[PDB]
């Protein structure tokens, strides 16, 4: 009865909690606990899914802008929206979970071709949603050209989340590179390419910003650079 009333709520709550984990000290084991939690979540979902397959009105998930009888695909597409998010590992586990949930979906269960089905209408919106970042599109990347350190770090987070989303998609073979590159080509990709000549491996202390080691935490900046 409780899961019949509570599956998506706690799931999105844990998503957000781990997102907060990205927002602070990320080395603590709380991330492992959330990972184990969502493992339990996917384990019960794969154990019990037919209720999710039907639109069953549960408690509204905290992250759920609409309001209707909740279905599996509801939160499936909701999580799909929550990709490219500036929580690189939260986004990574999210996309891997969704990938393992395509079998759970009542549509193209075995085929990844459900992504192809949504691609027909969403030919380009994956650039603005699945690859939302880089510069949140462009805009976060243009400010990175004249340039704080925290802004640098969050921009790197967004860019790397988008890049890893690209890599996961292409290596999954669930999407073609020509579909994502050359048709919905992202300027942020080559902007980062240029930024490599700008700051990566030669500006190991600055980003040609002139606007601001431990007094400047160049260690974590370098950690991000190597990442």
Curated annotation (Swiss-Prot):
Superkingdom in the source lineage: Eukaryota
Modified residues (N6-acetyllysine): 116
Post-translational modification: Autophosphorylated at two clusters, the T2609 cluster and the S2056 cluster. Autophosphorylation induces a conformational change that leads to remodeling of the DNA-PK complex, requisite for efficient end processing and DNA repair.
Compartment annotation: Nucleus; Nucleus, Nucleolus; Cytoplasm, Cytosol
Record's subunit section: DNA-PK is a heterotrimer of PRKDC and the Ku dimer (composed of XRCC6/Ku70 and XRCC5/Ku86). Formation of this complex may be promoted by interaction with ILF3. Component of the core long-range non-homologous end joining (NHEJ) complex (also named DNA-PK complex) composed of PRKDC, LIG4, XRCC4, XRCC6/Ku70, XRCC5/Ku86 and NHEJ1/XLF. Additional component of the NHEJ complex includes PAXX. Following autophosphorylation, PRKDC dissociates from DNA. Interacts with DNA-PKcs-interacting protein (KIP) with the region upstream the kinase domain.
UniProt record similarity statement: Belongs to the PI3/PI4-kinase family.
Record's disease association: Immunodeficiency 26 with or without neurologic abnormalities: A form of severe combined immunodeficiency characterized by reduced or absent T and B cells, recurrent candidiasis, and lower respiratory tract infections. Some patients show dysmorphic features, severe growth failure, microcephaly, seizures, and impaired neurological functions.
Described function: Serine/threonine-protein kinase that acts as a molecular sensor for DNA damage. Involved in DNA non-homologous end joining (NHEJ) required for double-strand break (DSB) repair and V(D)J recombination. Must be bound to DNA to express its catalytic properties. Promotes processing of hairpin DNA structures in V(D)J recombination by activation of the hairpin endonuclease artemis (DCLRE1C). Recruited by XRCC5 and XRCC6 to DNA ends and is required to (1) protect and align broken ends of DNA, thereby preventing their degradation, (2) and sequester the DSB for repair by NHEJ.
Protein name: DNA-dependent protein kinase catalytic subunit
Natural source organism: Homo sapiens (Human)
Part of the intact protein present: 1094 to 1336 of 4128
């Amino acid at each position: 009865s409780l899961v019949e009333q509570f599956v998506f709520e706690a799931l999105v709550i844990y998503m957000e909690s781990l997102a907060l984990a990205h927002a602070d000290e990320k080395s603590l084991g709380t991330i492992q606990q959330c990972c184990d939690a969502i493992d339990h979540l996917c384990r019960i979902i794969e154990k019990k899914h037919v209720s999710l397959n039907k639109a069953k009105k549960r408690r509204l998930p905290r992250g759920f802008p609409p309001s209707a009888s909740l279905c599996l695909l509801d939160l499936v597409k909701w999580l799909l929206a929550h990709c490219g998010r500036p929580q690189t590992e939260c986004r990574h586990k999210s996309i891997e979970l969704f990938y393992k949930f395509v079998p759970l979906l009542p549509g193209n269960r075995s085929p990844n071709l459900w992504l192809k089905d949504v691609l027909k209408e969403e030919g380009v919106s994956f650039l603005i949603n699945t690859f939302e970042g880089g510069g949140c599109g462009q805009p976060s990347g243009i400010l990175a050209q004249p340039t704080s350190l925290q802004a640098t770090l969050c921009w790197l987070d967004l860019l790397l989340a988008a890049l890893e989303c690209y890599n996961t998609f292409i290596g999954e073979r669930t999407v073609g590179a020509l579909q994502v590159l050359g048709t919905e080509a992202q300027s942020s990709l080559l902007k980062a390419v240029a930024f490599f000549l700008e700051s990566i491996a030669m500006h190991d202390i600055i980003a040609a910003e002139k606007c601001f080691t431990s007094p400047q935490e160049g260690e974590r900046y370098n950690y991000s650079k190597c990442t």
